[PDB]
């Protein structure tokens, strides 16, 4: 499966530049926006929009390229054509295939924060990792009732290597006898995934 | 902006003087890959993903040449504005849940990048250490300044203390994030 | 891989010629035809698209089948001057072309 | 317009020939071709812009130079009787649905 690429337009005739191509899908390839963009400094200068058909200038700076592009034919219609070149067409192929089916589980590791003292505080961090895609659901259990109070997530830390991170802290007391449960949902999991740690 | 997915199929970024440049593809935040500029290969972040999907290096090459010469008359239609400088920001965090003795991975988030020219260097207790190091390219964000993120591949000790040296045009002196 | 058919072909003037194409990679997309006189160099002569299935412009057309990976040359009504070299190539999103071995073309009078 | 230089050529074995295309059209990609009966048109190096260049389909036996956007270079450096053919220079626009060739050049290099 061969994924295609957006092609910059020439322009017309410490510094830095930039070109992408943007590929907005919403369910799936239903609905399909396309959005070119090219950068000077970090200021965006022109753009093309599958919503307004054509290349506009966003700044002053790209008014001759914006009009050039959309008199040339064989350019502006070669820009529009990526919406289904580009987008369409890596997602259906290429994307199906590699991002779009990725499924790694997450790890599940309770853990206490300090040396345990029975009938002192201390605190559970219950560490989900290693996983993909983002959606994930996490939670803390105290002999099988939902914990909210003296609970916290991180944000969703992501790894950069394809796969996610979250961790989630439980303020506590253990008591001999209870059992505390991490409770995680993804969806590379067939059945919900309990970690226990005993008091 | 509102989307479930987006790729961004073709990333181009020159930089000038030097003749720096990368060009990538992303997909909901995540590298699928860049183009070796020198080597002319395409390289997939994950080899399982270089399996299934193929991208010719070559579509690369040729953007980079578009945009090497839009930089320039970019440069001079400007009349020769030059970049401003931001001061980066750096996290560090362990890859793994840290248990002392097993081989982990410590990661150094470092953000708000530009221009995209940045060191980034691992210490030791202040010493270098260049462990399995692995940089990723730099990432694109909403307001057009980058993030990279380096690794470390270290043994946990309690008597190691790391930090992520940064250095940066945007710095007064290197920034250390300690961890 | 981009192969023609047949090496030359003699056609009666006032003939349709016909010069066959095929090629194997299923992702390209634009196929442009070459016309060669000898002593010169070759030059676009009309071209099509995987999105269409026919290109006219005058006394040439291009039939294009993407499920056969098959193209097709016609010259109506050909002239003396009909007389050349026609290459088939093909291009995968606007990266460089690849050629056919080509087809010579000999109207007869 | 392209025009190749020169437009015929007698080399011998083992000698050296450069053959220069200059291209007139602003055009930032040229192309280096080669063309025998029973293998039509082969790619043998081309050029995004100055100061690079891009192995083709049969790279091997030739170097190739593009010090200029005008002007792009086959070098043989060590001349065999294997690339006696003629050869065409191209230019085209990034992406370009065409390409614009020169007129060609004979090279016979005879041992």
């Known amino acids: 499966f061969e994924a295609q690429k957006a092609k910059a337009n020439k322009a017309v005739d410490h510094f830095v530049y930039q070109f992408m191509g943007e590929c907005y899908f919403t369910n799936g390839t239903q609905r399909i926006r396309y959005v070119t963009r090219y950068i000077y400094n970090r200021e965006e200068y022109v753009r093309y929009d599958s919503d307004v058909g054509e290349h506009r200038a966003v700044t002053e700076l790209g008014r001759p390229d914006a009009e050039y592009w959309n008199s040339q034919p064989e350019i502006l219609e070669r820009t529009r054509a990526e919406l289904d070149t580009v987008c369409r067409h890596n997602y259906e192929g290429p994307e199906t295939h590699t991002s779009l089916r990725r499924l790694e589980q997450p790890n599940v590791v309770i853990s206490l924060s300090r040396t345990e003292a029975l009938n002192h505080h201390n605190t559970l961090v219950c560490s989900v990792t290693d996983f993909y895609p983002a959606k994930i659901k996490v939670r803390w259990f105290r002999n099988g009732q939902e914990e909210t109070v003296g609970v916290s997530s991180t944000q969703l830390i992501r790894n950069g290597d394809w796969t996610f991170q979250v961790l989630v802290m439980l303020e506590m007391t253990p008591r001999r006898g209870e059992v505390y449960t991490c409770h995680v949902e993804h969806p590379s999991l067939k059945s919900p995934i309990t970690v226990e740690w005993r008091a | 902006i509102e989307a479930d997915h987006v790729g961004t199929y073709g990333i181009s970024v020159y930089q000038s003087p030097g003749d720096i440049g990368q060009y990538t593809f992303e997909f909901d935040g995540d590298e699928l890959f860049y183009v070796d500029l020198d080597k002319k290969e395409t390289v997939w972040m994950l080899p399982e993903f270089g399996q299934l999907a193929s991208f010719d290096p070559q579509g690369g090459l040729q953007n980079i040449a578009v945009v090497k010469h839009n930089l320039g008359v970019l440069t001079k239609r400007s009349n020769s504005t030059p970049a401003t400088n931001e001061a980066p920001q750096a996290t560090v965090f362990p890859k793994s849940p840290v248990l002392l003795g097993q081989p982990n991975t410590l990661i150094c988030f470092v953000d708000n990048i530009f221009p995209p020219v940045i060191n980034i260097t691992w210490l030791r207790n202040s010493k270098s250490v260049a462990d399995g190091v692995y940089e990723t390219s730099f990432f694109v964000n909403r307001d057009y300044s980058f993030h990279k993120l380096s690794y470390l591949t270290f043994i946990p000790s309690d008597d190691d203390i790391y930090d992520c040296k940064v250095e940066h045009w945007g710095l007064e002196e290197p920034v250390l994030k300690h961890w | 891989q981009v192969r023609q058919s047949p090496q030359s072909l003699t056609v009666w003037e006032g003939e349709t010629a016909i010069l066959n194409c095929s090629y194997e990679?299923?992702?390209?997309?634009?196929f442009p035809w070459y016309q060669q006189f000898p002593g010169e160099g070759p030059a676009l002569l009309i071209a099509?698209?995987?999105?269409?299935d026919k290109k006219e412009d005058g006394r040439f057309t291009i039939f294009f089948n993407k499920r056969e990976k098959k193209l097709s040359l016609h010259i109506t009504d050909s002239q003396p001057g009909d007389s050349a070299t026609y290459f088939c190539?093909?291009?995968?999103?606007?990266?460089?072309?690849?050629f056919g071995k080509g087809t010579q073309l000999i109207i007869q009078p | 317009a392209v025009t190749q230089s020169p437009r015929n050529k007698v080399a011998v074995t083992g000698g050296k020939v450069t053959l220069s295309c200059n291209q007139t059209?602003?055009?930032?990609?040229m192309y280096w071709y080669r063309q025998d009966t029973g293998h039509g048109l082969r790619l043998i190096h081309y050029?995004?812009?100055?100061?690079?260049?891009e192995k083709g389909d049969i790279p091997d036996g030739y170097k190739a130079s593009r010090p200029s956007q005008e002007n792009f270079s086959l070098i043989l450096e060590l001349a065999t009787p294997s690339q006696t053919s003629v050869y065409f220079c191209?230019?085209?626009?990034?992406?370009?649905?065409?390409?614009?060739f020169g007129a060609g050049t004979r090279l016979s290099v005879l041992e």
């Open positions: 059209n602003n055009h930032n990609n």
């Open positions: 191209a230019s085209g626009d990034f992406w370009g649905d065409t390409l614009y």
């Open positions: 050029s995004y812009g100055a100061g690079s260049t």
């Open positions: 099509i698209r995987s999105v269409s």
């Open positions: 990679n299923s992702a390209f997309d634009y």
């Open positions: 190539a093909a291009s995968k999103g606007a990266d460089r072309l690849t």
